[PDB]
Design a protein around this ligand. Structure first.
Ligand SMILES: *[C@@H]1O[C@H](CO)[C@@H](O)[C@H](O)[C@H]1NC(=O)CCCCCCC(C)C
Ligand SMILES: *[C@@H]1O[C@H](CO)[C@@H](O)[C@H](O)[C@H]1NC(C)=O
Ligand SMILES: *[C@H]1O[C@H](CO)[C@@H](O)[C@H](O)[C@@H]1O
Lengths: 166, 7
């Protein structure tokens, strides 16, 4: 498995607009539509992205397209960032996926702030990096996801990924 | 169903 299935486990999936934990309108696999409080604003952003009158509801193929765009944006973010790019360059593909997941969640600037953990990863110090990453605010606030992401950094394997909707 | 989650 791969970055796409990983983020599927970590982000959920909606075919109808919903409010994320911060109260923002979202659809698909964690695709933020707007930070405006207006549902009509969110729908106009969605209609613009999709090129039709969606009424807040998208198809699976449309969700998939937004998702691939957002994954590509996470990678562009890494590649543009002078702290992230050399770490990423040095990582194997599995650990690269873990870095992309973090950027997907919190943005390049957030991930770039993990200065010590990034140096540890650059030095292949996997256990130290995992220990250090678990000290963070991120880990405390989203531990289910952060544990899995951290195990992926630690092991370089997909082992951590191996109701309430429908 | 038809919508997603998880709630
Ligand atoms: C939905 O969750 C159910 C309850 O856990 C599962 O039984 C069911 O298999 C799940 N369905 C899917 O994951 C398939 C939906 C296809 C979504 C693909 C769109 C994304 C954007 C690639
Ligand atoms: C979806 O809900 C299930 C059941 O509570 C939970 O295990 C899983 O972590 C949830 N996924 C996300 C992305 O929140
Ligand atoms: C699961 O339940 C919530 C009800 O709170 C809905 O918002 C959602 O669309 C889904 O039906």
């Amino acid at each position: 498995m791969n970055i796409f299935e990983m983020l599927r486990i970590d982000e959920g999936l909606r075919l109808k607009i919903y409010k994320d934990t911060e109260g923002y309108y979202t659809i698909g696999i964690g695709h933020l539509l707007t930070k405006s409080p207006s549902l009509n604003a969110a729908k106009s952003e969605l209609d613009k992205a999709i090129g039709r009158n969606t009424n807040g509801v998208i198809t699976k193929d449309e969700a998939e397209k937004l998702f691939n765009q957002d994954v590509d944006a996470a990678v562009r973010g890494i590649l543009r960032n002078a702290k992230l790019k050399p770490v990423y360059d040095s990582l194997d593909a599995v650990r690269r996926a873990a870095l992309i997941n973090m950027v997907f969640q919190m943005g390049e600037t957030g991930v770039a702030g993990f200065t010590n953990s990034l140096r540890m990863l650059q030095q292949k110090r996997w256990d130290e990096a995992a220990v250090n990453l678990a000290k963070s605010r991120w880990y405390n606030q989203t531990p289910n996801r952060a544990k899995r992401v951290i195990t992926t950094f630690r092991t370089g394997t997909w082992d951590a990924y191996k109701x309430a909707x429908x | 169903x038809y919508x997603x989650x998880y709630x």
